[PDB]
């Protein structure tokens, strides 16, 4: 275990842990609450690099976390979707990918049409599914 | 968690009236209720009434709601969660049936299902509503009745005869010796005069170099005389 | 748990505070440590005294350029007879304010004994006088006239204080860079309540007969402590975990 | 008190005992919650049960209970010697006060009987100065708590110097008591020798001094 | 008794810490005469309504000498004063030999 | 009621309200949309203190809100967990804590092993529970 501890292991192992990566993603001991505590101008070059790094920290976290909210998966770490898998994406079989490719390799295998999957993802799970209440919310 | 200690021994003539006090510590005095219960000689402990240090709403029993009025001041904080407070209780017109031991005790919980019941109890106060007058006690030595002292250790004590009112305890010089000493319950003579005895469980060895002075602290009489044991002895 | 403090004015003052906050009870006395003769003493009133100050000098403005765009504003030529700057204190109002303090100080210093007030005691000329700013010109008033009486064992006249003026200043003992305050053209008059005080030692009298407290606004941060005695900020932690006999759905 | 408790009940070590308390409809326990108290006489009391079945903090699960349509109960399991004392109870609602009981004498039998270390105590040299005759005697750790008063004043019968006084429970959870002598110095000095009579069923080993 | 843990978001608890605060004041100098040395050209406007709650049952301990709001105050004024003098006329040429005289002793 | 209105009341009362604290946690009237609106350099000491305070505002909100998301409790304000309570934490009983300690006192009673509870919290409710679909997601 550890942060990215299973980065080189098979995809089945990264499926098993996963939180250790998600936990250490927003806040860090490195930030350490700023201030010297314990000259009186904090306009130094260091303060500029820190604050612009604290911004992109939450700017990149919220850019990805906004994606989880529009897919109905905000509350959980792994959610299933109602989008069928299209064979043009990969020809490999069920146990052939989860035990032989590792995630590091997999991100390069879908990076071509990865944005296209994201487009179809907002539709089937939250554009129609959240709409389907119309008939079932009350009759 | 904090010893609510009651200051007492105050006793007067029937119908005189008196106020009793209970000093608190070790808990937020603000929002725990404080109750008053007594046990008389004819048994049957009787709850007097509860009172809330906040707001001040109180509900006293109907049997005492016309002659008993109890009030209480505020508290001084010690920490964010502890404080020191005190409670008072006033009564009017009393007779021998009102004689007995009186306890003040902290209300159990800070909620709405059950609070009026006490939880942690004071040390108690012995009230005497007797028409008899105050009398200083009489101190007498306890003779060295022969007892086995194998290992060089033997018991002794000092006797108290004819005293009134309320009981008191026996102490020792400068404290130190409190564990393993046994003073015995008070006695009621048919004459109306109380008495009591003390017996210490410490090494006595040979009489002389060790300390044998028993200390007595008392009531209206107070104390000045603390007598030792006379030397002539057996074995 | 107010989200915002009260109206705090940054009254740059020395020895005596102005335009401050006062609690309702009789004058308050706060020390980090009483009996450490050394630590200074803040004093909050219950009713403020009114002291008005005014500079009678009629300064004319003379702008002389020293290069381009830059223009030095020198004191011109004075109009009218030269008059020293002054401060008025209602002697009636002052005698009681000084009395309520020694009553509160009684229960904090040797109970009933002799309490005297002396003029500043040692130090530099600008820190031992009631320095402050007013309208732009910086006054330094002689406080020896207010801390001279002593009471112990249980239309109207008005005290006045002599004051001199300085145009060169670098405050907070800051040796980095000083500034020249240009003379204010026209008439000067300040009218601010005096609400706080600052006191100091009686040397190192080992026990003995009596106690004396002379003013010494040695530092500037204590002036704001007279306004911030009651406040303190805290960090909310919204995350709490507690047990109860309740669990969510079994499988999911 | 308009309530009745189980009065005197007994029980053996390592076993259980149950005490009942009940009353009429005014003070009934159908709806009013019930609390219980441990109360050594004279000593400071202790709370044990506060909300029907739920026991007070720190109290061992040795104690239980239950509430029915007409009475409430208290189950004490694995009886140890400490339980030998008096117990009470109080009925109440959330907004009302307590209404206490009448009392329950509990005796824990099956204990080993201990032999009391008995000592006679003669008068002192400072006591004869006051002309008040008094003679006592001590007993401790002699369970059961049964006593017998008897004195011999030079083999003559006594009816005025014999003072039969109350026994007390020792701090060691055993029993203790003492008897006293009220007499005049004339009839006192006329009898120089004295004897102590402690009727304790066992061996004839009693201290007897003049 | 199978007691389970349960989470609560928004619990009223706090610990003593000191963060960075900021300015608040309403309409003050404005058009007729502005350029105040302290309030600058703009401070965040204060809300007309002040929010005060009388926290009940609580007995928090204060300390006014170990409080850091006064030290934040101190370093703010110094940096605020120096910022209001930095862009102005420097009087370095004013250091010359000065020949001066009294005035009307008569 | 009010912000922290039940801070001194029993834990049962803070359980009853709670939102008033959670609501006034991210945004404030104090921030008041900056700008003077209604000299042209906003590099003043005030702008530095404000912006660094607006950052730690959302930096502390998202650091705690990230914890709610990895526990499956993101969507709600109070969620139950499948972690059994371990007796070594407190010996007190059910009604003994919720009616006698107040939260202010309680945070000091768990602050020693509070981080250890958080560790076990990610596991039982989202490391296993979100994984349990493997068998139940489809058979
Ligand atoms: C922090 O400060 C707060 C104050 O802000 C302190 O809070 C106080 O805490 C004490 C602790 O005991 C409370 O004392 C009693 O509370 C009782 C609550 O009983 C309710 O809940 C129980 C179960 O928990 C129910 O059984 C009760 O009745 C239910 O069932 C009945 C049938 O059997 C129904 O008929 C009924 O409708 C209900 O469903 C009940 O719901 C309370 O009973 C008791 O009352 C006594 O004081 C009263 C004072 O005023 C109360 O009542 C009036 C109406 O009479 C209301 O208008 C008030 O709002 C208030 O509730 C008095 O009137 C009664 O006659 C009784 O003498 C006690 O109130 C305090 O209530 C509580 N403070 C306040 C504001 O009342 C807190 O202690 C402190 N800090 C800490 C940490 O302790
Ligand atoms: C801080 O310090 C600053 C320093 O600058 C102060 O500012 C200064 O203030 C003084 C005040 O005295 C000013 O002096 C003034 O000068 C003007 C201009 O000079 C003309 O008049 C002169 C007259 O002589 C003076 O002294 C004699 C001595 O007895 C007096 O009797 C007389 O009244 C005067 O005060 C002339 O000498 C000068 O010469 C030319 O014109 C003459 C015109 O005729 C004059 O003299 C004849 C005799 O020759 C007289 O009969 C006739 O009445 C008249 O007086 C001419 O004759 C001569 O040949 C030349 O051609 C000028 O005409 C005077 O008008 C004022 O009277 C006064 O002396 C300073 O000027 C001024 N500084 C500056 C910037 O210049 C400042 O005040 C101080 N702080 C304060 C408190 O404000
Ligand atoms: C500190 O010193 C300053 C500088 O002197 C003082 O400032 C001046 O003080 C005086 C006296 O207190 C004030 O009173 C008078 O003001 C009159 C008005 O002058 C102003 O307006 C004029 C408009 O027209 C007026 O004057 C013309 C003649 O020119 C008339 O025909 C017409 O009817 C009006 O009356 C402007 O032209 C002028 O520039 C002013 O803006 C003055 O007329 C009057 O002058 C008399 O006194 C002068 C000495 O002060 C003297 O030299 C003249 O010969 C004349 O006798 C006088 O000034 C001023 O208002 C005031 N301001 C200014 C800018 O001068 C200040 O008062 C002083 N502090 C104290 C303690 O008083
Ligand atoms: C030296 O001390 C004297 C005596 O205090 C001062 O004279 C007082 O000056 C103060 C302020 O300079 C005046 O105080 C207040 O005036 C209020 C004006 O009314 C309303 O509108 C204003 C503007 O919107 C609001 O700010 C204000 O809150 C009101 O809504 C009064 O209404 C105030 O009275 C009562 O309510 C306020 C509301 O919170 C309370 O804070 C007050 O304690 C009070 O209960 C208040 O009076 C005051 O009128 C003057 N007189 C007196 C006798 O106090 C000198 O000004 C002062 N000098 C300096 C510079 O310190
Ligand atoms: C601007 O205004 C200031 C203040 O008024 C003046 O300073 C004063 O100047 C005068 C004259 O220069 C001084 O008075 C002189 O005192 C000399 C003796 O001084 C000693 O003793 C006195 C007390 O008796 C002490 O105060 C002083 O410190 C010394 O210890 C006298 O001797 C002087 O008189 C004559 O002889 C001397 C010596 O030969 C000459 O130098 C003189 O010119 C004169 O012929 C004179 O009385 C005074 O002490 C200074 N201060 C005070 C206290 O007022 C400035 O001089 C003045 N400038 C102008 C241009 O006016
Ligand atoms: C995602 O999908 C995109 C297409 O949308 C893929 O893009 C391809 O990327 C590769 C690698 O970057 C491109 O390869 C090219 O390599 C060039 C050098 O050699 C190339 O040409 C040699 C001879 O060229 C002849 O034959 C080719 C055959 O296509 C013709 O195109 C030529 O015109 C000539 O007739 C070949 O032998 C050799 O294999 C190479 O093709 C270089 O100069 C180019 O800049 C480029 O890098 C390829 O061209 C891109 N796609 C197409 C079809 O043109 C991308 O890889 C996909 N990613 C994943 C991982 O899925
Ligand atoms: C969380 O859990 C931690 C432990 O992991 C707890 O840490 C304890 O914190 C307390 C208070 O801060 C520590 O107390 C110590 O106090 C010292 C001063 O007096 C101490 O020693 C006196 C005599 O010491 C003798 O006996 C002690 C007994 O332990 C020995 O350790 C010594 O070596 C001596 O033989 C004692 O009478 C007195 O009670 C104190 O113990 C001070 O000098 C220390 O710096 C320290 O503050 C305690 O030591 C810490 N833990 C341990 C076991 O060492 C923490 O409180 C827990 N928090 C909560 C709230 O649960
Ligand atoms: C502390 O306060 C005390 C008073 O409580 C004060 O003692 C007083 O000092 C004043 C001023 O020095 C004295 O008044 C003088 O008395 C003498 C005669 O003794 C007069 O000659 C003086 O008159 C001249 O000076 C006056 C101005 O001071 C002029 O107005 C006058 O026209 C004269 O030129 C003057 O009246 C006063 O006598 C004493 N004593 C008392 C009881 O008032 C003491 O000085 C103060 N100490 C300090 C350092 O503050
Ligand atoms: C400060 O300077 C001011 C003047 O600028 C002095 O103020 C005036 O003080 C007198 C004192 O008698 C006041 O007189 C009386 O005021 C009352 C109201 O308080 C009024 O009812 C009477 O008719 C009479 O006027 C006068 O009003 C007051 N002026 C104002 C408007 O404040 C003040 O005394 C100086 N400070 C000191 C040290 O006295
Ligand atoms: C709150 O009440 C509960 C019961 O509802 C208490 O939990 C129980 O506490 C008793 C205390 O005696 C535990 O009994 C055990 O007895 C053995 C005897 O050998 C002893 O070794 C143990 O240390 C313990 O005392 C009982 O097992 C326990 N039950 C459980 C699983 O919770 C709780 O302790 C009470 N809280 C307090 C301390 O006020
Ligand atoms: C997958 O989608 C692409 C683009 O629409 C399409 O060309 C392809 O035929 C699809 N394959 C299937 C049958 O899923
Ligand atoms: C609680 O967890 C600690 C640490 O693993 C362990 O020592 C203790 O025995 C546990 N108590 C129980 C039985 O829940």
Author numbering:
A (entry chain B), F (entry chain B): 520 to 557, 564 to 664
B (entry chain D): 1 to 52, 52A, 53 to 72, 72A, 72B, 72C, 72D, 72E, ...
C (entry chain G): 244 to 306, 309 to 321, 321A, 322 to 398, 410 to 507
D (entry chain E): 2 to 211
E (entry chain G): 32 to 137
List passages from the publication reporting this PDB structure.
BG18 exhibits the highest potency among the V3/N332gp120 bNAbs described to date. To better understand the molecular mechanism underlying BG18’s interactions with Env glycans and increased potency compared with other V3/N332gp120 bNAbs, we determined the crystal structures of natively glycosylated clade A (BG505) and clade B (B41) Envs in complex with BG18 Fab. We found that BG18 binds the V3/N332gp120 glycan site in a distinct manner relative to PGT121-like bNAbs, primarily through rearrangements in its VH and VL domains. Analysis of BG18 interactions bound to a natively glycosylated Env showed engagement with oligomannose glycans near the base of the V3-loop and the conserved GDIR peptide motif.
We solved the structures of BG18-BG505-35O22, BG18-B41-35O22, and BG18-BG505-IOMA complexes to resolutions of 4.1, 4.9, and 6.7 Å, respectively by molecular replacement using synchrotron radiation datasets. Moreover, the improvement in resolution from 4.1 Å using conventional crystals to 3.8 Å resolution by exposing smaller crystal volumes using an XFEL offers the potential to examine natively glycosylated Env trimer–Fab structures to higher resolutions. In the BG18-BG505-35O22 structures, 17 N-linked glycans were modeled into ordered electron density, forming glycan arrays that extended ~22 Å from the Env surface. The BG18-BG505-35O22, BG18-B41-35O22, and BG18-BG505-IOMA structures each comprised an Env trimer bound to three BG18 Fabs and three 35O22 or IOMA Fabs, with ordered electron density corresponding to native glycans at the Fab interfaces. The orientations of BG18 Fab with respect to gp120 were preserved across the three crystal structures and a low-resolution EM structure of a BG18-BG505 complex, indicating that the orientation was conserved across different Env strains and was not an artifact of crystal packing. Indeed, the observed differences in the orientation of the BG18 Fab light chain on Env influenced the N332gp120 glycan conformation, as the glycan D1 arm reached in close proximity to CDRL2 and the gp120 GDIR motif in the BG18-BG505 complex, which differs from the interactions of the N332gp120 glycan D1 arm with light chain framework region 3 (FWRL3) in the 10-1074-BG505 complex. Despite variability in V1 across HIV-1 Envs, we observed engagement of V1-loop protein components with BG18 CDRL2 and FWRL3 residues, accommodating the V1-loop into the nearby positively charged cleft formed by CDRH3, CDRL1/L2, and FWRL3 loops.
